Amino acid sequence: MLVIPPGLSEEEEALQKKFNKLKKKKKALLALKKQ
Amino acid sequence: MFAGLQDLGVANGEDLKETLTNCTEPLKAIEQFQTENGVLLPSLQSALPFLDLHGTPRLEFHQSVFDELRDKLLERVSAIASEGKAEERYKKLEDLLEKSFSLVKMPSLQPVVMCVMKHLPKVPEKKLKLVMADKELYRACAVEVKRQIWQDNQALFGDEVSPLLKQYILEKESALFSTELSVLHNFFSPSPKTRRQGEVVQRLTRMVGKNVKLYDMVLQFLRTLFLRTRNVHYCTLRAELLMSLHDLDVGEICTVDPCHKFTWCLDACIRERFVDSKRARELQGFLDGVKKGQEQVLGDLSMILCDPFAINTLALSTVRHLQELVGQETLPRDSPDLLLLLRLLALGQGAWDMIDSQVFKEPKMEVELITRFLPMLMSFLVDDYTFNVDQKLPSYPNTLPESFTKFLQEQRMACEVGLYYVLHITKQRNKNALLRLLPGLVETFGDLAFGDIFLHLLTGNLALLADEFALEDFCSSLFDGFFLTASPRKENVHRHALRLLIHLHPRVAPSKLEALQKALEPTGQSGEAVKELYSQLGEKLE
Amino acid sequence: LSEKDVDPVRTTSNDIVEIFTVLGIEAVRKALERELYHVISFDGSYVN
Amino acid sequence: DREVLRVIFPTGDSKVVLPCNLLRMIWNAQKIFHINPRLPSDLHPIKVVEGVKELSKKLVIVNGDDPLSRQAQENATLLFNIHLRSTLCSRRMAEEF
Amino acid sequence: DDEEETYRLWKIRKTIMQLCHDRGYLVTQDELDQTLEEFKAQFGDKPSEGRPRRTDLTVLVAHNDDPTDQMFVFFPEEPKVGIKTIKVYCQRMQEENITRALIVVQQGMTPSAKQSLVDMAPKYILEQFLQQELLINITEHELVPEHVVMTKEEVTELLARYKLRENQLPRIQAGDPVARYFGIKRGQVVKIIRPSETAGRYITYRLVQ
């Protein structure tokens, strides 16, 4: 079995931050469009 | 023309001349030879005066009778091949063959010998060896005799196969270097069934036939030549031959092919152009189904996984899977199917390494790739989505992290994945993403970006960006970052760049057109195709 | 028409509103022409 | 033209309505010019073919040289042209009429 | 059930392939006339909670003339498609530069969803289709004559030749099943070919309105 370190790297933290920011932007955009 | 007649007692022209030379009265000897030794039938002797009377000599109807008896013999033996007791009649045909092997050298009866040899399922080995010694006898022999000959003749079989392999290479390099830079028609555009129906593949399927040893030896020759020349087309030819034999239901070959399930599944994935989860699990089970002591089979598996069609299908499936993960916002470590696809593609890449190194075990895959490089691709896609939302919300993120560049320039796996991601984002006609990842395209590991396949694919994808090719700055950046890095050095990159320029010459501005025509001037030490492209561009531009 | 073993080509409906809703405006025109021809030529008469 | 007819007319209904009664005109010509349908005649088949081809030009419904107009004219007189070519054949003009 | 539902899905897929082929989209010959057996062997032959579950047979097809123009064909699982599903399909279409979709619903989609669908028309073109209407191909019915969609150039040529304004042509409404089958919009003229028992062949024209 390959060794997969669960520890978050800078790449994974950046990906999670971009995920969250995209979530906020999508929610704001959908709120604007729904009006 | 009449050699070998003396063995059976039928005098030929040599002895006839040698006898008439020292005979004073040839007439009586000739008469006794044509009557007694010839057709001893009173009816023919009575017919002779009438045929003299017509003025048509005995020559013509004697020749007609000889030819019709030859035809009757061949047709009768053709019926004999399917009537009577099999073994007894086969032995009778063998007896006829051993009688007529003395007359095989005389062409007026040689078709009888070749027809008998064709009808007999197994010609005696000495006769086969004597036939192989002469080119005319070999070529005149039917496919059955060729099959019997090739089973024991390693060098002859390889030599006969070689021109077909050369023709396959020639047509493959004519397709990879074709001026039709269209999306609907690329190197992988035809379906696998159509490609296996090509002249070379069908000829190979016919000539290999239903012989296990011949098929195995063809496979081994393909493996050796692929190892020698590093030419990926030979793995494709092996897969095509096996799949064509499977389509024609050659059980003796499908049974002896251990990768039959795996190769059939890969062919199905290529035909459907997407490796689904079910087929991926099937492939994983087949790969893990190789028991201990049979690691050599793994090598064959790897050779199938290095197929350019399979490589392209797996790469596209992995890219789309990563995009689906981004849509699911899933970290790459969390997808076992992604890991399976990465393992499959790494095995395809390392097929040659495993074949040469003889260590029949799957190469280890370092985890920094999945943990860091793939999150960069996901982050680039998320940045694209964020910019799109901001456009819909009340500049473009083009910053390139150093980790992504390092992994693209050092990891062959990351190199290929990023290259196919570039192809995908270019297919969307997205200039901004292309220019963002162009600094990554500047340097790549293994020079896989400089391969013929990837250059052709990139030209086909960029064919949709004529409007952006109307911009001088975009063309300059694209050529400097990727093309001018290897086109002055590599002939293939130069040829593909000139193909792209020729296909998109009128969109390019005159200044950048002159820049491309001048900086990419053909050299004498390069191939003639580059000069032909330059001449074509010169003719068409004015 | 969706039923299996039922011919989806030669199956008519004898009703023009439903044919208009299902098949179209040219199909309803053809069906109306056929219905008129039948109802006029049933008695044996002929109209151009 | 036979294939086209079998496409347009299912159920094998060979009764149609057309302007000119070609058979009756042929009969009238036979009676007017005293054909005597027993001796060989003087009528080159190429004359029949050329006459039919030139006659098809004159019978016009849609007037114009536009490709659209040409197609409309060809469609309008399609059935009559098929009937005329099936009646004024080279063989029939020499074996039956 | 499973076998009858498999047959229904295969028939619907064949109808959709024929529809895409008629609109000029690049459809391979094999998938156009694929019988039931290869469909069973390709998708799983167990639609009820199995391998050929929906959103797996959705198809993306590129136009033959221009590879840059494509269409999605979606098969939502829910019988009554609501605003959430159409919104997520629109969001999926957002990531691509193609704005043509074809939704195959199983029952009447909600009125709010229809309002959103007709609102997003100028940027995102998409049409609904009840699965009942796709169990057959109405174009093969004998009552339906030949329909051809004409380019704007030949429409102008027609209007110039007959010297008539476009409002003088016979009309066809956008809700016509054939019009929805061909995906034609208002202001577009359709040539119709019929076999005429008096002339041999009649070509008429209909304006979408």
UniProtKB/TrEMBL annotation, chain D:
Residues that span the membrane, as ranges: none
Subcellular localization, as worded in the UniProt entry: Chromosome; Cytoplasm; Nucleus
Function: DNA-dependent RNA polymerase catalyzes the transcription of DNA into RNA using the four ribonucleoside triphosphates as substrates. RNA-dependent RNA polymerase that catalyzes the extension of a non-coding RNA (ncRNA) at the 3'-end using the four ribonucleoside triphosphates as substrates. An internal ncRNA sequence near the 3'-end serves as a template in a single-round Pol II-mediated RNA polymerization reaction. May decrease the stability of ncRNAs that repress Pol II-mediated gene transcription.
Similarity comment text for this entry: Belongs to the RNA polymerase beta' chain family.
Protein name, entry field: DNA-directed RNA polymerase subunit
Gene source species: Sus scrofa
Lineage: Eukaryota, Metazoa, Chordata, Craniata, Vertebrata
Gene name for this UniProt entry: POLR2A
Entire-sequence positions represented here: 962 to 1058 of 1970
TrEMBL record, chain E:
Any GO MF annotation of the entry: DNA binding
Coiled coil location: none
Biological process, per Gene Ontology: DNA-templated transcription
Location in the cell: Nucleus
UniProt KW keywords: DNA-directed RNA polymerase, Nucleus, Transcription
Residues of the RNA polymerase Rpb5 N-terminal domain: 3-93
Domain of life of the source: Eukaryota
Main localisation: nucleus
Record domain RNA polymerase subunit H/Rpb5 C-terminal: where: 136-208
GO cellular component: DNA-directed RNA polymerase complex; nucleoplasm
Family membership noted in the UniProt record: Belongs to the archaeal Rpo5/eukaryotic RPB5 RNA polymerase subunit family.
HAMAP family: RNApol_Rpo5_RPB5
Record-linked NCBIfam families: PRK09570.1
Name listed for the protein in its UniProt record: DNA-directed RNA polymerases I, II, and III subunit RPABC1
Gene it is expressed from: POLR2E
